[PDB]
Amino acid sequence: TQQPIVTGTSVISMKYDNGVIIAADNLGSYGSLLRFNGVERLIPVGDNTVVGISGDISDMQHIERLLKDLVTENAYDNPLADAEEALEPSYIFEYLATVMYQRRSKMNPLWNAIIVAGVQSNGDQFLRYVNLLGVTYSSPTLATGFGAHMANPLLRKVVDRESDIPKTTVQVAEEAIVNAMRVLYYRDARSSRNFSLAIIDKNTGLTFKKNLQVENMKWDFAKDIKGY
Amino acid sequence: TTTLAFRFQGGIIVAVDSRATAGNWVASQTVKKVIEINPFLLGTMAGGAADCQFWETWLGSQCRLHELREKERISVAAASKILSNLVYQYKGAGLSMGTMICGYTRKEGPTIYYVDSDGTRLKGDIFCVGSGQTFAYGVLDSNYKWDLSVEDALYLGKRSILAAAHRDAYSGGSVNLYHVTEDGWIYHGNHDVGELFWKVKEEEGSFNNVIG
Amino acid sequence: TTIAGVVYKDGIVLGADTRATEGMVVADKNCSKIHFISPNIYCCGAGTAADTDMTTQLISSNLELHSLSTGRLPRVVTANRMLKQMLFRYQGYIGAALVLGGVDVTGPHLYSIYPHGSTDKLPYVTMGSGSLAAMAVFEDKFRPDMEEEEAKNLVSEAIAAGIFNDLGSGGNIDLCVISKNKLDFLRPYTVPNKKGTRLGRYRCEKGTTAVLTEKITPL
Amino acid sequence: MDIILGIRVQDSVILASSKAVTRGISVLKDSDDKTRQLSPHTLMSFAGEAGDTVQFAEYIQANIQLYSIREDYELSPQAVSSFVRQELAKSIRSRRPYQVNVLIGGYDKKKNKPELYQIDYLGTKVELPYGAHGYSGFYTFSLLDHHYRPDMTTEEGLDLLKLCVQELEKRMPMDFKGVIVKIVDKDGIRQVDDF
Amino acid sequence: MDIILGIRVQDSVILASSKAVTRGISVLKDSDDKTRQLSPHTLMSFAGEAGDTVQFAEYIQANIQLYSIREDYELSPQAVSSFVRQELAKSIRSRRPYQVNVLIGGYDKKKNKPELYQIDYLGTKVELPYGAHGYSGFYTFSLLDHHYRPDMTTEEGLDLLKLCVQELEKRMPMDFKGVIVKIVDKDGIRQVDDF
Amino acid sequence: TSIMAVTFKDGVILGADSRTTTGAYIANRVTDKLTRVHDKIWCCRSGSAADTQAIADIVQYHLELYTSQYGTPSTETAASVFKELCYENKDNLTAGIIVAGYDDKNKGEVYTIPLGGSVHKLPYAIAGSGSTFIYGYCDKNFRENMSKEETVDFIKHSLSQAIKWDGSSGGVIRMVVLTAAGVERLIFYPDEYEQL
Amino acid sequence: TSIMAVTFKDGVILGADSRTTTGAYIANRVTDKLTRVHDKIWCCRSGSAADTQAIADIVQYHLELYTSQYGTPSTETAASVFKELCYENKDNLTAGIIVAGYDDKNKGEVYTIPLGGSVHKLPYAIAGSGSTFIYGYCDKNFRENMSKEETVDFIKHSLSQAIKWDGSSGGVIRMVVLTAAGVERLIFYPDEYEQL
Amino acid sequence: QFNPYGDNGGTILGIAGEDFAVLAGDTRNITDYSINSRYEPKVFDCGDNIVMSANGFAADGDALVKRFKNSVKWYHFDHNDKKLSINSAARNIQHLLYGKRFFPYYVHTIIAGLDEDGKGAVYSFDPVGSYEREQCRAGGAAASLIMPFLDNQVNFKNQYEPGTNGKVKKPLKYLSVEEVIKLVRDSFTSATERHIQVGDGLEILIVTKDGVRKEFYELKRD
Amino acid sequence: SDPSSINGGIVVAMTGKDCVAIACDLRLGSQSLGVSNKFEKIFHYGHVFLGITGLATDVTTLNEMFRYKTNLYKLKEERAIEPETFTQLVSSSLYERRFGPYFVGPVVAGINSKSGKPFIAGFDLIGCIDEAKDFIVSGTASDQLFGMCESLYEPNLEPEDLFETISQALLNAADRDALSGWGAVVYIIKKDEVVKRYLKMRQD
Ligand SMILES: *[C@@H](CS(C)(=O)=O)[C@H](Cc1ccc(CN)cc1)NC(=O)[C@H](CO)NC(=O)[C@H](CC(C)C)NC(=O)[C@H](Cc1ccccc1)N=[N+]=[N-]
Ligand SMILES: *[C@@H](CS(C)(=O)=O)[C@H](Cc1ccc(CN)cc1)NC(=O)[C@H](CO)NC(=O)[C@H](CC(C)C)NC(=O)[C@H](Cc1ccccc1)N=[N+]=[N-]
Ligand SMILES: [Mg+2]
Ligand SMILES: [Mg+2]
Ligand SMILES: [Mg+2]
Ligand SMILES: [Mg+2]
Ligand SMILES: [Mg+2]
């Protein structure tokens, strides 16, 4: 048993026709204090998987080292480490899910919520969630913490069920994700303007975008507010 | 839950209700609260459903290993003490167990041992265990004697569960009857309280607190 | 519960879902949550349901007496004050969470009132368990000075977000459009879910139940 | 306090009440009468919190006796039971509630019928053929379910009651020092001295 | 459990132990023997936490019987009491202590003297002319202070004990269902059947 | 919340952010924490929204009734009425209020009233959860008798930093200028202040 | 406690106050919170004195044994050893450490390690109870590639303000300068810094 | 303080016919008032014609299913590819559950299949391993809503022969797979109407001697 | 010590074609101990029927209170109170005790004598009105009743059919609850006749 000290807020994600998108802001909060403004919470594993992490940042950094160490270990005695025997999203997730549930079962959890986004060998989209309790689930859209309440409603209007995934292009999906990140910046007190986004496509591969910003911000209506 | 077992002229009667509860939620009315350990040994289940079912099933395995090792039927005294010494090891961990180990051997004759999760182990002629034990004791004590026939003893055990099934909210469903003699145990049916109550009311002229 | 309101060009559009719950159980699927305060002022209600009904009824009664005495239509600011001051005095124990909307001599006004007696005066608000789902829709698509049918659609869309994504909310969508020239009380505005069709007829035939005694008395 | 029982038969209501008054590890008295006559044909037994019991009983007794003098008339058992219930139902939401459970045995002279009412400290009233308060009921109710008939005589009722006291003396953890038995019928209230 | 008494007279130690085993609102048994013979001239009565009591008694019994077989010799009452004390004194600082209080009545054949030892669950040992565990002592000790003489016979000791049981049956709150009485003297251990 | 009031040559300016939260949810991103208790006596509100709103309303009522009988109240008098409510109801209130007003005799005045209901007259005052982060900055950068433009910049830079570090603060920076000329309302949006 | 470390053109400077308290009693007014773990790798200590002293001693031992086998450790390596101790014993430690060192390849480097045992490489870092009051100031006044004299002034002015507002901070301002030239110890007394 | 348990909602239902058995479950997964997924299956084919669901805390449910699936695998390895009968599976699951008696799996487990005589079988377990064979069993959040309906329609509880004065009960009988699926679908639509945690979709696994078949139906998404 | 589940009990009401039904069990207990099998939970004031579940002292008190209030009503108004009006009176009376409530679950049932319309309603302990076209449920087996009613109920049932539906709803719900049962009463209510039937049910 501990308590989380330095923290990261929402990680959001969705599927689209050819792959998956995942995003998270670059803030490390220290309670109400917006302490660290340059924290990367999307951590790529190979060229087919991105693991987005929220919650305790010290525990995130521990998980980052476990993944880095997983890549090293897979390469050992593996001539097909960059081909047929490369790490899959499903392998990386199952490992983390095993760890998370083991740690909760020893009453010493890793204080995080994690989304593993990627594309598999056969072109299938992979998107799955795991948290500090070892609870796992998949859905066309996934979001952690605050994003579950505000991002999912918006993202589900683009992909409401499985059959909407082939109908959704990468442009429509990325717009929705960037739009959701704006809404979260208005309304989440422990969020920031600066964020990272990662697309994993079956054709174009892994695109990792840094130093994005929320823009097109509606504040004009604020001048007309007089008292309560 | 209401479980009873008593000793008389022609052996041992064992009777139990069949209701399982999770608070006020009636989870089942077709539950087995008697465990058949061997042709000469029965175990009753009160308290925690899992704790009783598990450790009394395990008891049957330990009784089997005794008769393989020793080429002889385990005594009721020894069988009951395996269970009592087991629960005593788990004492303070929160096991919930109120049980009766009933059986016959040539050595000791018909014998009943009460065993519970806080370590108590008692030999005796009459026992009632469960949330409805008091209701069963009331009918059983006031109509009991060694004299009793096998027909009357089976009925009294049936009737004593019915009494508790009526008054106790957590007892009911049906009555499972067992008769234990020198030759072994004999099952004497599953009697639904739904029908049994009205039949006993009509034929006996009792339960006048009831509209019907 | 998902309740919401917006200030549009000509006036106010209020919105609400229709699910009433008893813990995890739905007690009423088509329950009305938009309450009458005065002819030009209505009030959506969330939180403790009895507190919401009794607080809006009391302030509606007192405003009726106020309006009979003064001989003029009541204002939203007085509805706001009377609700506010009462709720403050009871220090949060009256669990009424209201979206108050109406149209005065001074134009359209929209308030959110909280149980402890704080109010915010805003161009759009959402309350209840589905407020975050609904607020996401408003932050996505709201702009000032919308036309009527557009504002209707935005509120409806915001309530829908609550219905589908929040488990506490459900059922139909009720709207209330308030302007200087009219009041449109739309119940239901939309039926987003059809009632589930049952495949079998489980109703028992006559004589099936076992009766003891019978008594007939005429009136 | 502790044990109070009641049985309504054909022509009378019988109340049995334990004699012990225990405080701590000492039985202070073994002859305590846990009953008050409310009117000539109405008797109330009581059990519960020390002090509260007698204070409540005597308060009810004064009020019924006042009514009797004012109207030169005896209130029915039903009427007395409803008055008592209401006093307890008021009490339960007071600053300090009466923690007293009662049985009211009465003979209604207008109906020529015995009546037994069980009322708990919350003000929960029921009319019953037989009643009990506290742990006593857990043994007696099932016993009476079996052996009770609605047409019994006062003698049959007393034997049925002996059966209850015997069962309580066998299975109850505490020594309650026996019971005082009282009969309420058409001729009023009398105490059985040899029980 | 509950009542265990002991009286040492001129030529014997007498132990009296209550027969009731109560759990909740039910007296499960009224014939329970709360004693184990440790050796031919040593008897131990016990009271305390359910399960713990018999488990501890039988464990001590096994150990003394093992000693007897090994050395072909009977340990003195003093020696047995010191062994028992130490086992309890170890136990009190265990993860789960034995919650068992004991009396040990023995006849030392080398000294030709009766001996009575009172030991509580902490391992507090005293040799006494008369002893009690639990609430029993609060009535009996003062009574025995008055009526006990060191030169009494076994018959006088039994009458003195009847006086104690009578006082407990009058003033104790719980029904303990009488006592089993056992005498330890030069000829060993025997049970009085009519008490 | 990050609020402040600053006296200068021509009078006094009040400043505030526009964020109200329930835990980490922003219930209102466009809040007005600068409230009028008289024509030229205003206050900045911090603490419980319900408490500060109820207090400000009572004070406005008191000063309206004062004006009816005795004419324009002094800024000191307004602060005394706030204090009286805050002090006597300290056990039931979470209110940190800065009171700021313009007299023609006394010019600009600032009174701060922390949680206990004590009163402190100061050249400038900062309050709210975000104030902690700007004590160092404000002490180093405040000068007496600044101009209007300098004081606007001092408040804008200060609340900019308070907002940057405090999660409970944000949205727009509202200001109210109190001078002999009258009452001026200023607003500054994120796209301006964030990149200061 | 008010501590900080700041990178500049020629390397890095560490700074700290000298106050240790038990509640409101000052147990030591001349404390040294800047401690050597290697020739040119130093740390600033905040939190429990006993915890930070025990950690620093273990790290100094680790780096001495590293040096015996593999030569001079990098500043990153020193920070990693601190992190490893802080992270794995998070439940039993109250330690907020800033690690600062000078390499010739990497120049000046600052790593901060807050309560959870996370690591953050930064251009400059502030920590301790007094740091809260200077976030605004330090963010406004820090520039990259400052001179030695500018960086000394930046630390002196910053800790001056942290000391002024924080009761848990005070005494002297100690500094340690880490450059290619060597190790320099600086001290600044109240009579100088208070009137800045 | 850290709480190691959570509640993921959902509800499950098992019915047994003469030569078949069904095990149904809704596909909605929740925490508090939020939906995690509209399609997250929790009824699984475990091999040897055994279907299983462990409803409650989904982390414990997945762990248990995972361990039992692995238990089937090792049963084949250790006993010459012998088929694990439903009664042997049940007893094995008791030991899995009771092994964590003092740190339970927060779930209600149900398994379905065919017994060794080819007849339909359903077994249900409490969180610590008390088990029983039954005809009917609903588990999870809406069990209390569904179960009394099942008693009335499957077991004809409380119902008597018309004109018989409540003297002759209704004769029980076996239901066809068509009839059973009607009851499952209607049980879940009723539960969806009145319980907030139940909805989105219904997945039924049907077990005959020919193997394991699936059917899927939409449920209300509000 | 949860006041609404000490004594136990249930009430259910339904509407049909030009009729209404209201039913209740007969148990009164003290936690596990069954005390009375004659404790009816349905009362009437003229043609308006009121069922009350929950703490039995409050059930009795509220009956006595509404008898009082409807008697005075009838004397002053010179007519019997109608279901819609009575429903409002129940709500007002319960909310009067907002911070010290009666621990009850009342259910109104009846036919408006002017309009001929069947009317049912339910309340929480604090007065919130729940109106319904179809059915209202209350008591310790309310979950069970909700499930039974939602699957068995259909609109516009004839009085004889509606009797079978409501009885089967109550009986099967009561048998899945430890604290409910011990006998049952059903009231079938038409425009100018009321039929009261006692049901045979299992007595455990
Ligand atoms: C009556 C005993 S009583 C009321 O006097 O305590 C029965 C005896 C009994 C029932 C069933 C069997 C064999 N199948 C043997 C004896 N006891 C019960 O009904 C107990 C009440 O204590 N019920 C249970 O143990 C139930 C059984 C379920 C089938 C309903 N289970 C539980 O209570 C557990 C508790 C639990 C454990 C871990 C985590 C969460 C909850 N499940 N639940 N709820
Ligand atoms: C949604 C608000 S929410 C879930 O987002 O907080 C509705 C709002 C609402 C519905 C209906 C009306 C009617 N005009 C007005 C507003 N609120 C509810 O559904 C609440 C949930 O909190 N439900 C209730 O308050 C129910 C009323 C039902 C009978 C219909 N009452 C209870 O649940 C009471 C509450 C209570 C009050 C005091 C003390 C204890 C419990 N529970 N009970 N009993
Ligand atoms: Mg029962
Ligand atoms: Mg307050
Ligand atoms: Mg901010
Ligand atoms: Mg639903
Ligand atoms: Mg029942």
CATH of the domain at F5: 3.60.20.10
User: Is any ligand 2 atom within 6 A of the Cβ of residue C1?
Assistant: yes
Backbone phi and psi for residue C122, each to the nearest 5 degrees, phi listed first: -140, 155
3-state SS, residue H104? coil
Side chain identity, residue G13: I
Give the separation between CA G194 and CA H16, rounded to whole angstroms.
Answer: 85
Token duo for residue A45: 């594993």
Way the structure was solved: X-ray
Residue G81 pairs in a beta bridge with none
**Residues in chain F whose Cβ is within 8 Å of chain G:** 132-140, 157-158, 161-162, 164-165
- Which residue's alpha carbon is at the smallest distance from atom 6 of ligand 2? C47
In a mutational test of the B interface, the residue from E19, E21, E22, E23 whose CB has the highest number of chain B CBs within 10 Å is E23
Q: Which of D114, D139, D132 is nearest to D16 (CA)?
A: D132
Of H2, H40, H103, the CB nearest to A138: H40
Bridge partners (DSSP) of residue B206 are none
User: In angstroms, rounded to a whole number, what is the distance separating the alpha carbons of residues E26 and A29?
Assistant: 61
**CATH superfamily membership of B1-212:** Aminohydrolase, N-terminal nucleophile (Ntn) domain (3.60.20.10)
Q: Which domains does chain C have, with CATH numbers?
A: 1-219 (3.60.20.10)
Looking at the structure of chain A, the number of domains it has is 1
Alpha-carbon span I72 to E17, nearest angstrom: 69
Q: Is D51 left (phi over 0), alpha (psi -120 to 50) or beta?
A: left
Q: Which residues line ligand 1 (CB under 6 A)?
A: B 1, 20-22, 27, 31, 33, 45-49, 52-53, 130-131, 170; H 104, 126-128, 130, 132
Inform me whether the C-beta atom of residue H178 falls under 8 Å from chain C C-beta atoms.
no
Domain boundaries, chain H: 1-222
Q: Are C101 and C8 in contact (CB under 8 A)?
A: no
Closest ligand 2 atom to Cα of C168:
4
- In terms of Cα–Cα distance, which of C79, C61, C59, C181 is closest to C121? C79
| Contact at CB, H190 and I150, closer than 8 angstroms | yes
Q: At B107, which amino acid appears?
A: K
Dihedral angle sign, alpha carbons of residues B196, B199, B200, B206: positive
Size of interface B-I (CB pairs under 8 A): 62
Locate C217 and state its tokens: 């008395």
Q: How many Å lie between the alpha carbon of I26 and the closest alpha carbon of chain D?
A: 12
Domain that holds residue F84: 1-196
Contacts of A1 (CB under 8 A, 6+ apart): A107, A108, G91, H1, H2
For residue I101, say if its preceding peptide bond is cis, omega within 30 degrees of 0: no
Q: Could you tell me which residues come within 8 angstroms of residue B70 by beta carbon, excluding any fewer than 6 positions away?
A: none
CA distance linking residue B136 with residue G122, whole number of Å: 77
CA distance linking residue E189 with residue A96, whole number of Å: 70
Please tell me the distance between residue C91's alpha carbon and the centre of ligand 4 in angstroms.
5
**Architecture, CATH, for domain D1-195:** 4-Layer Sandwich (3.60)
Distance I171 CA to ligand 7 centre (A): 9
What does the block give as tokens for D95?
């600053």
- What distance in Å separates the CA atoms of residue I145 and residue I152, rounded to the nearest whole number? 10
Strands (E), chain B: 3-8, 11-16, 20-22, 25-28, 34-38, 41-44, 46-47, 97-105, 109-116, 121-123, 126-129, 174-181, 184-192
Separation CA B44–CA B35 (nearest Å):
6
Answer yes or no: do E23 and B116 touch at CB < 8 A: yes
Q: What are phi and psi of D97, to 5 degrees?
A: -65, 145
Contact indicator for D173, E28 with CB cutoff of 8 Å: no
Determine how β-strand G3-8 pairs with β-strand G11-16: antiparallel
Q: What is the C-alpha separation between G187 and H177, in angstroms, rounded? A: 89
Q: Is H100 in a helix, a strand, or coil? A: coil
How many C-alpha atoms does I77 have within 13 Å on its Cβ side?
11
Return d(Cα F74, Cα F55) in angstroms, integer.
18
Query: What's the rounded Cα separation, in Å, for the pair C87 and C89?
Result: 6
Sheet holding G34-38, edge to edge: G34-38, G41-47, G95-102, G108-113, G120-122
C173 — phi, psi (to 5°)? -110, 120
Contact B197, I203 (CB under 8 A): yes
CA distance B53 to B74: 20
Handedness of CA H96, H98, H99, H103 (dihedral sign): positive
Q: Please work out whether the CB of residue C52 comes within 6 Å of at least one atom of ligand 2.
A: yes
Atom of ligand 1 nearest to the CA of H130: 14
The resolution, in angstroms to one decimal, equals 2.6
Contact E11, E114 (CB under 8 A): yes
H1-222 has CATH 3.40.50.1110 classification: no
How far, rounded to the nearest angstrom, does the alpha carbon of residue F58 sit from its chain's CA centroid? 17
E169 in D contact zone (CB under 8 Å): yes
Ligand found nearest the CA of A32: 5
In this structure, are residues B97 and B5 in contact, taking their beta carbons and an 8 Å threshold? no
- Residue with CA nearest ligand 2 atom 9: C49
Half-sphere exposure of D28 (CA within 13 A, CB side): 7
Q: How many CB pairs under 8 A join H and I?
A: 51
> Which ranges constitute the DSSP H helices of chain C?
49-70, 76-89, 131-141, 148-165
State the distance between the two ends of chain B, measured CA to CA, in whole angstroms: 25
Q: Ligand 6 being an ion, which residues bring their Cβ within 5 A of it?
A: H 192, 199
What CA–CA distance (Å, rounded) separates C141 from D85?
63
**Bridge partners (DSSP) listed for residue A117:** A50, A127
DSSP class per residue in E73-106:
SPPPHHHHHHHHHHHHHHHTTSSS---EEEEEEE
Number of domains into which chain G is organized: 1
Q: Which residues of B11-44 are buried (b: 16+ CB within 10 A; e: fewer)?
A: bbbbbbbbbbbeebbbbbbbbebbbebbebbbbb
Please name the chains neighbouring A, where neighbouring means 3+ C-beta pairs under 8 angstroms: C, F, G, H
Q: Please check if B169 is assigned to a binding site.
A: no
Q: Are strands G120-122 and G108-113 parallel, antiparallel or unpaired?
A: antiparallel
